[PDB]
């Protein structure tokens, strides 16, 4: 009767509601995964930037030491050759 027809219209509205809800929730979830993927890419990029900076800093530190040692050995060998009395 009139209550069955009212409930049938409510049932129809519910079916349409679940369709829209699922579709829209899927769109929100996709944008959520898209944000998490970008956050993870940023994290790796920052850590690789820090690693490259420290790597280049260590190369400079090694080079400066190698230079000072090379000049010290050259000056010591020059001195030795100059101290030969005979």
């Amino acid at each position: 009767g009139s209550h069955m027809a009212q409930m049938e219209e409510e049932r129809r509205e519910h079916v349409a509601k679940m369709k829209k809800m699922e579709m829209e929730m899927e769109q929100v979830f996709e944008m959520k995964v898209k944000e998490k993927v970008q956050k993870l890419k940023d994290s790796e990029a920052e850590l690789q930037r820090r690693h490259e900076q420290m790597k280049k800093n260590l190369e400079a530190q090694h080079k400066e030491l190698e230079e000072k040692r090379r000049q010290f050995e050259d000056e010591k060998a020059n001195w030795e050759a100059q101290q030969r009395i005979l």
Partner: protein
């Protein structure tokens, strides 16, 4: 009826809640692995820094001995 329809809404809302939660647990683990890999590489470079400092200090001591010998030689 009306209560079953409300329950259907809640089941879908609970589904997405759990789906987002499991997705978040995978991202948290990928970030964890990422942090461990780069922490490992950082430790190695911090030991390189201390070895370089130690080498610099050793070369400075050799230079002192050499200069003191040059002054004491002539």
């Amino acid at each position: 009826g009306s209560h079953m329809w409300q329950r259907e809404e809640e089941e879908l809302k609970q589904r997405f809640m759990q789906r987002v939660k499991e997705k978040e647990a995978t991202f948290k683990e990928a970030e964890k692995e990422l942090q461990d890999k780069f922490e490992h590489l950082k430790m190695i470079q911090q030991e390189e820094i201390r070895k370089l400092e130690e080498e610099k200090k050793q070369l400075e001591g050799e230079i002192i001995d050499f200069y003191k010998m040059k002054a004491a030689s002539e």
